[PDB]
Design a protein around this nucleic acid. Structure first.
Lengths: 86, 80, 82, 127, 205
RNA sequence: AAAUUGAAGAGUUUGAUCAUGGCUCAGAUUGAACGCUGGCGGCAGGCCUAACACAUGCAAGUCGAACGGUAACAGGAAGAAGCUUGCUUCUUUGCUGACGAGUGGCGGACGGGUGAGUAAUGUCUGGGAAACUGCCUGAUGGAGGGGGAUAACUACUGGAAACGGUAGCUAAUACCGCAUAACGUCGCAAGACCAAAGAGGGGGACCUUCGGGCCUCUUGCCAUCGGAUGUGCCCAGAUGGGAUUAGCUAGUAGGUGGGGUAACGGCUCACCUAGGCGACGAUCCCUAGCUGGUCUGAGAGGAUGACCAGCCACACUGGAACUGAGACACGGUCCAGACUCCUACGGGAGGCAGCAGUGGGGAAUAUUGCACAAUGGGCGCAAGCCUGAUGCAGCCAUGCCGCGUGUAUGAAGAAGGCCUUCGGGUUGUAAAGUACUUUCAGCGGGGAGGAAGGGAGUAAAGUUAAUACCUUUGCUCAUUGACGUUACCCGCAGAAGAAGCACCGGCUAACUCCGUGCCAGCAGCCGCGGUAAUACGGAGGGUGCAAGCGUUAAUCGGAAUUACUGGGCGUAAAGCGCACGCAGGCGGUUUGUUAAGUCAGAUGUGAAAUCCCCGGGCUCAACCUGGGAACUGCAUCUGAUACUGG
């Protein structure tokens, strides 16, 4: 970049990018564990997995990695499905 | 506060949808003759109670599909 | 945010300001929300020169609109005049 | 290429003077044009030297175009006559390539590069 | 921006005295008043309808010392204004400062009065106005400023003035060299061999 | 009170006529150019072409009151000395006024440029419902206790440069756990789950580890529900042309369910139904940013979309996402392309449609200027710093408006020129002479306003333990203008420095002589030129404009010559060679009904500017400005039911 701060911003945005990426990848992992339990038909594994997932979709919302509404749908959606089976 | 349209059913083929035509007379902007104009609207018909040729009362609502932003309120006249 | 300030109209060497409420990001002579006074710095002062709808200014402040250094002065000046 | 330069206080006062020098240089230009054509005192050449070659020259530097042209008129002979047309201050241009389009001529430069609009004309017509 | 050439030529072409000289002299002893200028002055113009309209407009312009652009703008304003356009044109002309200065007798001619104006010898309401076309209003007081008061042109100008018909709508004090534009002149105040409607016709076609 | 209360025709077909019909002219207008000419000023305008390519400077920073900090300069200091004993220079130490580089915060999504793309994820009008929203704002509570890092820096090392490699090492409002957790999110509920950060100013007992504790106020941080502003989304109507384009469509149209977004949605995927669009113009092709408005017209229209303002789109070309409240980013990142620059040859760097400026193209469009003083934006508690936004200045008669280039007197009316029947006429009161004025330009002298604030003190209130600090409001003192030699006023010198352009046969205001002789030439249209040419060219005279005047280009007008208002088709251009007939248009007469068309009223909206009316301010005018009227339109509701439609 040409301007002093523009240079600095590219550096900061890359750091943030690697920070966000790391936390975001983690989060989707814990979401995916729940969908995987559901697809195997286990209430407990899927409830257990939902309980681990809950606090982290909530936290990443508070931290701006995602919006509150996204966290809610995930909880709403998974909760809907797990109940529909056991 | 119930804004509404009235028109007749030109197609009832789709599952839970209908095509409604709203026809009106309009003064021609230049030559003054009163001309027929038609507005076709894709409308929601849960329960498919609307038959082709029916005259129906419809209202505007949120998007229901790529092309549906209207739903059925009630049938007015049917099976001419 | 929303701010109350002077949009400079008039002609070269003969400034004339229109007091306006607007989104602070819009250009000075660009999009505004409401016009609320004017200010002639070149008025003969034999008659008028500064007119403010103080009722609507306050209404906008009540909803968090900020106020220019120059409008903040006009308001204290006009409040003093009467 | 060279001359006496003098600064002035205001540009407006120096505008009329500069335009005045152009008028004299233009008046003598048309003057020398009328003489050379009328000098023959006949509608054509008395003999068969009428066949000639035309050239088009634009040099990056102003000093050369006046200087080398004098040397370019030294190689001139009675049999074949060569003449320069539209000596340029630099580079190349649309009206210059057009100048070589009307009358067949070689387009040469002491130092020049082809403009983006210049390449299109030169590549299209045969030059 | 001003007509600077011979003046009696203009009178001679229009067929009338245009008051472009002081009036000290019978105009016929200064020029062949009843003959147009030039080799073919004796010739008569079998004059078209357009011709009579043109010459009438020229006449008025030449009386007041106004060139085409400003005079056309005067027509436009007369037209825009309420009431008869032809009469409005003459109100506007007759309200000019160079004109008013002439009518109060401060200048022997409108040309002389105009010079008085331009040369900062005239005040309006004790305020210096130096542009000829300044529109003068009811109750205004135009005066020769103190320093210009001893100019002999002005005394002579007031003498001649005293020998012309005296305008109704102006109150002039010759001693003070001040005067008051009481009101806009009516149509009836102004000469009756001016044909404004011809000028109005020329500018509507 | 006023505020669309306005409308012209002429030449040219014929021997002549009337009609038909085209061509042409008078008018307004312009971002103009060219030719001749050119004094001043005010206000405006200024690449219409190549969304061609760009050297150089500048156009986005700021905060030490978040943080470790010193390298510059500035003081200060135990202690070195300049020592001529209070003046001091350097060795030192961030002690502090500050501050390079660094982490961190907020801004680089605004301001500014362009109109390529787009006939619709556009614009205009009018409505909807499923949403987010930094800074500013109201409400109610948090702001507990910890942890591991890292740039800077240090050491070693690679590069020509750009910029790196190792290992050390350290701070925070950087970053992460843990606790706390509802008027928040999920859930029928029971329950389950989510955050944070400090930094400053001043200080009374009181005292220590002299850091501060503690007291106090300012400010920032977290949560939730609001306000305001911004933005996303959906529907309807309108918004160019072409049928020498008639059929178009597989995420296509809908349904179910999963996923997805801030949010509704074929947004996406699977499955199912077989739909959806189209002659009321789809599809395809050409062209184009839309609007307020602008020009023209009596109007209805026609033409148009510089300058000002609103929306959109773009940022070398094609594609992409990252950061962020906001971007798929105008001076950010990545990939590919086109192109250019640097190189020590191995490798690097960049994107003016920001402001100047350059090359190129063109009939044609400006200075590589001054200033943040004013308004406004970014950061900061502030002081302030930044701001080619902006305010100004330069250039160009490009346009509009104003003024000047003198005023008065001056006759047998000179000389010269021009015409003349040689009598005289004219140029012409024109000139000379005579007085007289001095705007503007020149030169000296003086001198408003655009300035509000901010800075020291002071005093009072609200604060508080407090007279501190903070903040508000009065007081005094000293101060802040790029423009600038400002506007304007006074003085000096002398008419002194300031007039050109086109036209004069009819249309069309203005006539004669000489030269030429169907030549040279003119020409908007008719038409001039072979011996008297008011038509060519010169002259004298005259007409029209005037710092301009002509020519060319260009829109509308006149043109009722695309005719809705407002025309025609026997012989003038125009009835299909004839009939049947789908779609379409139109449809006799009565009643009832309906209330879409139509009509009425009410309400909201129709941005500001512009236009118009009455006022106000610059000496006037252009120009600036207050208020009004107007926006003839759209939409919702409620009525009326004669006519049209059902």
């Amino acid at each position: 970049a040409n301007i002093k701060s523009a240079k600095k911003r590219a550096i900061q945005s890359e750091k943030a990018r690697k920070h966000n990426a790391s936390r975001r990848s983690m989060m989707r992992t814990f979401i995916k564990k729940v969908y995987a339990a559901i697809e195997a038909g286990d209430k407990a594994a899927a409830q257990k997995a939902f309980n681990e997932m809950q606090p982290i979709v909530d936290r990443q919302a508070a931290k701006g990695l995602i919006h509150k509404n996204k966290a809610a749908r995930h909880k709403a959606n998974l909760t809907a499905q797990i109940n529909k089976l056991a | 506060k119930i804004r509404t349209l009235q028109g007749r059913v030109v197609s009832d083929k789709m599952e839970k949808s209908i095509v409604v035509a709203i026809e009106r007379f309009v003064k021609h902007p230049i030559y003054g003759k009163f001309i027929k104009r038609t507005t076709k609207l894709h409308v929601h018909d849960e329960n498919n109670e609307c038959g082709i040729g029916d005259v129906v009362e419809i209202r505007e609502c949120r998007p229901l599909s790529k092309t549906k932003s209207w739903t059925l309120v009630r049938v007015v006249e049917k099976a001419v | 945010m929303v701010t109350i300030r002077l949009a400079r109209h008039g002609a070269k060497k003969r400034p004339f300001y229109q007091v306006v409420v607007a989104d602070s990001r819009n250009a000075r002579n660009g999009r505004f929300i409401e016009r609320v006074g004017f200010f002639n710095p070149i008025a003969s002062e034999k008659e008028e020169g500064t007119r403010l709808d103080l009722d609507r200014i306050a209404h906008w402040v009540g909803q968090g609109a900020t106020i220019s250094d120059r409008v903040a002065a006009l308001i204290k000046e006009v409040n003093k005049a009467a | 290429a060279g001359d006496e330069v003098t600064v002035v206080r205001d540009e407006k006062k120096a505008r009329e003077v500069a335009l005045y020098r152009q008028g004299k240089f233009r008046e003598v230009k048309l003057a020398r044009q009328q003489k050379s054509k009328l000098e023959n005192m006949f509608a054509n050449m008395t003999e068969g030297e009428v066949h000639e070659v035309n050239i088009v020259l634009k040099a990056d530097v102003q000093g050369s175009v006046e200087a080398i042209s004098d040397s370019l008129l030294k190689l001139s002979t009675d049999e074949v006559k060569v003449k320069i047309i539209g000596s340029g201050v630099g580079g190349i241009t649309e009206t210059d390539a057009t100048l070589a389009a009307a009358s067949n001529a070689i387009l040469v430069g002491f130092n020049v590069r082809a403009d983006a609009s210049a390449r299109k004309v030169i590549e299209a017509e045969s030059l | 921006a001003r007509y600077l050439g011979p003046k009696l030529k203009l009178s001679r072409r229009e067929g009338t005295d245009l008051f472009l000289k002081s009036g000290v002299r019978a105009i016929d002893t200064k020029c062949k008043i009843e003959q147009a200028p030039g080799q073919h002055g004796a010739r008569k113009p079998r004059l078209s309808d357009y011709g009579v309209q043109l010459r009438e407009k020229q006449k008025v312009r030449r009386i007041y010392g106004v060139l085409e652009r400003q005079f056309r703008n005067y027509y436009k304003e007369a037209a825009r204004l309420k009431g008869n356009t032809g009469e409005n044109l003459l109100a506007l002309l007759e309200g000019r400062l160079d004109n008013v200065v002439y009518r109060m007798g401060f200048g022997a001619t409108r040309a002389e009065a105009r010079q008085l104006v331009s040369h900062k010898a005239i005040m309006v309401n004790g305020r210096v106005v130096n542009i000829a076309s300044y529109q003068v209003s009811p109750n205004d007081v135009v005066s020769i400023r103190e320093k210009a008061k001893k100019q002999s042109r002005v005394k002579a100008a007031l003498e001649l003035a005293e020998q012309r018909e005296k305008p109704t709508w102006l109150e002039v004090d010759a001693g003070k060299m001040e005067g008051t534009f009481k009101r806009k002149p009516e149509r009836s105040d102004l000469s009756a061999d001016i044909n404004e409607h011809l000028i109005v016709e020329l500018y509507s076609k």
